[PDB]
Write a protein that binds this ligand. Structure first.
Ligand SMILES: [Ca+2]
Ligand SMILES: [Ca+2]
Lengths: 61, 60
């Protein structure tokens, strides 16, 4: 925020300007966007099963 | 009568070494990274006072 290029600048999710992540502060952040391609099974009716993603850190520097 | 040995003359001085050659006082800091991170940081300093008529010091 104390430099020319970063005067009053925000960071938000691509394509969704109303969801601001960072505003006028130094917070290193990465945004992972998820998109699904699916084929439902024929005749199967289901209500509320979850889709679970697990993240495991391998190396850091 | 009296035969002097001509030895009873003396002059005396004193010597002392009451201080160690150096004094060390520490003003070090801290290293606070994240888990597994890579970085570098200044820790601090350490003052090494030099005592009377000491000119060269070899430390380990
Ligand atoms: Ca590492
Ligand atoms: Ca000396």
């Amino acid at each position: 925020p104390d430099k020319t290029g970063y005067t009053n600048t925000s960071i938000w999710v691509p394509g969704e300007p109303d969801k601001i992540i960072v505003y006028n502060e130094t917070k290193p952040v990465a945004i992972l966007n998820f998109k699904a391609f699916y084929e439902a099974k024929e005749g199967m009716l289901f209500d509320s099963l979850p889709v679970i993603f697990n993240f495991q850190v391998l190396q850091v520097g | 009568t009296t035969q002097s040995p001509l030895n009873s003359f003396y002059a005396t001085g004193t010597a002392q070494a009451v201080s160690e050659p150096i004094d060390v006082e520490s003003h070090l800091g801290s290293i606070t990274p994240a888990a597994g991170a890579q970085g570098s940081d200044d820790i601090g300093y350490a003052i090494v006072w030099i005592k009377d008529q000491v000119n060269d010091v070899k430390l380990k």
